[PDB]
Amino acid sequence: RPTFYRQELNKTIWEVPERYQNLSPVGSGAYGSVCAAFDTKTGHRVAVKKLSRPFQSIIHAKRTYRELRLLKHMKHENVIGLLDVFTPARSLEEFNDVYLVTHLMGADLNNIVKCQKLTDDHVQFLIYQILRGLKYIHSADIIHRDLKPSNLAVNEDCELKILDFGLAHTDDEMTGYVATRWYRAPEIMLNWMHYNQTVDIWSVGCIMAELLTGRTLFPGTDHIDQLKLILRLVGTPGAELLKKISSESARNYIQSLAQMPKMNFANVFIGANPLAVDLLEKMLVLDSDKRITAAQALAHAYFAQYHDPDDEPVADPYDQSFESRDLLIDEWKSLTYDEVISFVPPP
Ligand SMILES: O=C1C=NC(=O)N1c1ccc(Cl)cc1
Ligand SMILES: [Cl-]
Ligand SMILES: [Cl-]
Ligand SMILES: [Cl-]
Ligand SMILES: [Cl-]
Ligand SMILES: [Cl-]
Ligand SMILES: [Mg+2]
Numbered sequence: 001r002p003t004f005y006r007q008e009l010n011k012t013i014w015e016v017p018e019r020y021q022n023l024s025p026v027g028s029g030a031y032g033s034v035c036a037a038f039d040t041k042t043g044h045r046v047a048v049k050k051l052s053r054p055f056q057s058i059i060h061a062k063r064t065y066r067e068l069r070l071l072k073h074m075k076h077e078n079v080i081g082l083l084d085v086f087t088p089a090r091s092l093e094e095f096n097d098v099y100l101v102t103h104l105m106g107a108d109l110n111n112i113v114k115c116q117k118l119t120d121d122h123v124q125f126l127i128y129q130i131l132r133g134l135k136y137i138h139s140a141d142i143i144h145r146d147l148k149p150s151n152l153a154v155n156e157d158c159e160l161k162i163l164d165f166g167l168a169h170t171d172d173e174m175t176g177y178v179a180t181r182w183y184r185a186p187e188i189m190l191n192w193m194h195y196n197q198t199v200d201i202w203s204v205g206c207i208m209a210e211l212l213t214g215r216t217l218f219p220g221t222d223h224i225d226q227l228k229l230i231l232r233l234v235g236t237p238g239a240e241l242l243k244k245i246s247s248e249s250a251r252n253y254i255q256s257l258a259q260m261p262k263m264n265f266a267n268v269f270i271g272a273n274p275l276a277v278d279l280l281e282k283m284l285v286l287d288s289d290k291r292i293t294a295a296q297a298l299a300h301a302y303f304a305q306y307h308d309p310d311d312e313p314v315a316d317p318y319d320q321s322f323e324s325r326d327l328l329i330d331e332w333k334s335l336t337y338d339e340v341i342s343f344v345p346p347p
Helices: 058-073 120-139 198-213 223-234 239-243 248-255 274-283 294-298 329-341
Strands: 004-009 012-017 020-028 032-039 045-051 084-086 099-103 152-154 160-162
Touching (some): 012 020, 012 032, 020 045, 058 084, 058 099, 058 329, 120 198, 198 274, 239 248
Antiparallel strands (some): 004 012, 020 032, 032 045, 084 099, 152 160
16 A cells, blocks of 8 residues: 555645645536646656545445446547546545546647637548547447537647546536537437437537537527527438437427428538548438447548558447446445455556
8 A cells, every 4th residue: 555645735635645746736626626746656747536525425426436437447549548546545444535547638629629620631630539439438338428529638749538428417507508518419408319329429520510610510509599500400300210209299399390401511511521521411410320330430431541440449348237236325335445446557
């Protein structure tokens, strides 16, 4: 066991192993507080996150376990990984605090596209990396659920990593003129049907459009204004898709709208590479059953310069059976403790 030292930073007690030095507060959401630090063992600048109230309820205890299981599993060049996890506790009886350590991220995709469009070669490389990461994530039957520019880290060499997996956002966070909703697939924005991995491909289409134009594709002022923007581009549904909407009330609302045909995407994305237009048409499909998958998209001719099927790996199998399990707070806490002490660091 390493030696720990204590300090107070912005009214918060931080107790961390001696290897982590020069701690500096960076942010604090509702799930914890974050400090930048220097890791003397690896030489990396790192983010250290102290979870806030990790075991305050059954819901919160299960969410802590879910987050740690997911971060321990992810081992791919285009996905955030876990460098370390620690607790100052010396036994399960005194276990209360969880700290997570990752590589410190600089700019996100917003700070690169803010009010600005990129060249086609840059769009090819950035979207290729998102899809390479997504092929890996989806091969473990994981759905990200919250892909958007602020959840994509980018460096000066245009290299990209996916972060901030959806751990299951409030009603108020999705209300109004907000980027938190602009990248969401229509079937989950209005709870038409059950989530599945195709929702992530819709988000990639929205991101790719915004890189090509410099502007948000569907900047709706509320859920219904956004749906109207979506259907104007991709057309109103046929009876095939209407059949698959379990909400009778949602079926009734869609049929209240005047019918609209799918628009010509070459007249929307003026001047774009025709191969980019073709790929957008295959991602931005209303019926989720018919969207292109990440593995299929990597083989599309838009990525001929980068595609290498011997260098696009899949993930080890991932056991999610805990998600349908009903446990008490102290049982979720015990499972989490076991995962902290069994962590093996990367090479
Ligand atoms: O799609 C592309 C590729 N280059 C562009 O300048 N666009 C683009 C299209 C429409 C608007 Cl309104 C703005 C930008
Ligand atoms: Cl140490
Ligand atoms: Cl990483
Ligand atoms: Cl503790
Ligand atoms: Cl964003
Ligand atoms: Cl597993
Ligand atoms: Mg985020």
